[PDB]
């Protein structure tokens, strides 16, 4: 129903930039959103959170390099990634949560990012 | 949300009074099965799922997310955490009771 669709990954040179995006149905309006990444040999791990009113939170390893943002309707999440490093290589995933007592948590399909050299 | 979003790597989700989310029929049917109802064969029990899917939390509880993004429920009164919504155990017992009633 929500059907999260990610894009913007691929291969990139170290020092370059990407802009990951994830979009949901127009009738979605999320309480909380975030990007995560699962690196080789590591379990899935936070990259950045953003709330419905625009407050953000970053993993220390990306805070000075990445910017998470949402749109006015709160049904899309964006991750600007600058000065990419080989250790940023991972499958990235976008998460979005709506709440009605119970939390309803949705994930995109996964976005491969490989930083070379 | 609040200026901090996480405490000790745990995101605490807060729902407003005017916040609105209407879940999908597919999600209602999935929750129905998870609390033990057969939606095709037991439509007379489905009112329990339609109520339970959006059951409010007691004020002591919030939905949370760990550093991996997994949802859980936290009881701030005693520090207990659980994967399930704290009412789901009770809905499962109600299903058993109500199935008996209609039999």
On whether the CB atoms of residues A13 and A85 are closer than 8 A, the answer is no
Structure method: X-ray
Residues 6+ apart with CB under 8 A from B79: none
> Do the strands B71-75 and B61-65 form a parallel or antiparallel pair, or are they unpaired?
antiparallel
Virtual CA dihedral for A9, A13, A17, A19, nearest 10 degrees?
Answer: -10
* CA separation for the pair A98, B53 (Å, rounded): 13
Tokens of A54: 């625009």
Tokens of A42: 């590591």
* CA separation for the pair B76, B60 (Å, rounded): 6
**C-alpha distances out from residue B40 to B28, B29, B33, Å:** 13, 9, 10
Resolution in A: 1.7
Q: Which domain holds residue B57?
A: 3-102
CB < 8 Å from A in window 61-90 of B: 63, 65, 67-69, 71, 85
* CA separation for the pair A32, B71 (Å, rounded): 12
Sheet holding A18-23, edge to edge: A5-7, A18-23, A76-81, A66-70
- Extract the runs of DSSP E, i.e. beta strands, from A1-117: 5-7, 10-13, 18-23, 32-38, 45-51, 56-58, 66-70, 76-81, 90-100, 102-107, 111-116
CATH number at residue B38: 3.30.1470.10
User: How far is A84 from chain B, CA to nearest CA, in Å?
Assistant: 22
Residue located via tokens 């149905």: A25
Domain boundaries, chain A: 5-114
Q: What is the DSSP letter of B56?
A: P
Element (DSSP H or E) covering residue A29: none
On whether the CB atoms of residues A80 and A19 are closer than 8 A, the answer is yes
The CATH number of A5-114 is: 2.60.40.10
* CA separation for the pair A14, A84 (Å, rounded): 5
CB contact under 8 A, B63 and A99: yes
Element (DSSP H or E) covering residue A5: strand A5-7
Out of B3, B5, B54, the one facing A102 most closely (by C-beta) is B54
User: How far is A21 from chain B, CA to nearest CA, in Å?
Assistant: 18
* CA separation for the pair B1, B34 (Å, rounded): 31
Out of A44, A102, A105, the one facing B53 most closely (by C-beta) is A102
- The 3-state DSSP class for residue B31 equals helix
Residue located via tokens 């701030």: B76
* CA separation for the pair A104, B41 (Å, rounded): 26
What is the count of structural domains for chain B? 1
């Amino acid at each position: 129903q929500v059907q999260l669709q990610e894009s913007g990954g691929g291969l990139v040179q170290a020092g370059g930039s990407l802009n990951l995006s994830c979009v949901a149905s127009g009738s979605s309006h999320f309480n909380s959103m975030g990007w995560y990444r699962q690196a080789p040999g590591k379990q899935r791990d936070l990259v950045a959170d953003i709330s419905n009113d625009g407050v953000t939170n970053y993993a220390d390893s990306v805070k000075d390099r990445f910017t998470i943002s949402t749109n006015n309707a709160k049904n899309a999440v964006y991750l600007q990634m600058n000065n990419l490093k080989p250790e940023d290589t991972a499958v990235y995933y976008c998460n979005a949560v709506a709440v009605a007592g119970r939390a309803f948590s949705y994930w995109g399909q996964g976005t491969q990012v490989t930083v070379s050299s | 949300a609040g200026r901090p979003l996480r405490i000790g790597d745990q995101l605490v989700l807060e729902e407003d009074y005017d916040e609105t989310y209407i879940p999908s029929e597919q999600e209602i049917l999935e929750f129905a099965r998870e609390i033990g109802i057969d939606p095709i064969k037991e439509p007379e029990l489905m009112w329990l799922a339609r109520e339970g899917i959006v059951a409010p939390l007691p004020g002591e509880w919030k939905p949370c997310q760990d550093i991996t993004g997994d949802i859980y429920y936290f009881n701030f009164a005693n520090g207990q955490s659980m994967w399930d919504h704290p009412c789901d155990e009770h809905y499962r017992s109600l299903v058993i009771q109500e199935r008996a009633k209609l039999s």
